Amino acid sequence: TFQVECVESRTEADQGQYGRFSIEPLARGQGTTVGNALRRVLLSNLEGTAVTAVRIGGVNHEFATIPGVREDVLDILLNVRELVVHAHSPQPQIGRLRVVGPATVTAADVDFGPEVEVINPNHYIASLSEGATLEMELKVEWGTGYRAIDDFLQLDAVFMPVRRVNYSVEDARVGTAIDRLVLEVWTNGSLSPQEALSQAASCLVALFEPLKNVS
């Protein structure tokens, strides 16, 4: 019997949200149990969307250049691996970019479908000079956890909605040994930290439920 209270919530400019929760009173040793389980589930067992592959018109390898584009293929790939998207359908989607001329290519230029929302609309991707056309095709998939790899260039997508999890255990002794959990959650903005916390708790409850009524 405890009470979870969001002490603080923020929305950093990069659209990355932050939250801190105080959970108390917890019995001695339960703070670490809850904190570690929540951290593992949040960072490893939440679903999210990320750019899995990309095709660029004019190149064929990661170590290649694009005439008139300040960055090369590698810089664009790294700038796109951190592009944050959120899909409303379990079906993989394809977005198309075709900016041209002097321009700063940001996330807003990607023509995703109605089912894909770019969390940060101004996310630097490339900088085109005069008489340059950047033709790009991005593929968005549904996955969990950072996933390194072994036509379309395969990418090491970051499916994680949650960016960072920290927890600390204090002592709320009034006058036994009671504990208090302080949980800090940084999310990339695709989910609020309260939605990420709710989904992590749902996964844990679903894991521990069948271990109760039989064995």
Added chain:
Amino acid sequence: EALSQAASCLVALFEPLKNVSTPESQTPIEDLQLSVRAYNC
């Protein structure tokens, strides 16, 4: 039964985090129809 009790404790531990995260009394005393004396006091 210890495995069952431990699982029950865990489920009860993570349950609160699953989804947690009258017109007559507003009447001004003028409508009480008090005596002018009581009202004024």
Added chain:
DNA sequence: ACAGGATAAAGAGAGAAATTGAGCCGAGCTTAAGACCTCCTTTACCTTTTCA
């Protein structure tokens, strides 16, 4: 060390004083209910002003 001698300063003996506490009382004191007299309020109806 031990014995004798001189002395003053500190105990025992008693009653008489002064307190003292103890019972046994009724005089002082408190409590509660009811009645009961000033002071005040507010009304209903006026009279008495200043003015168009």
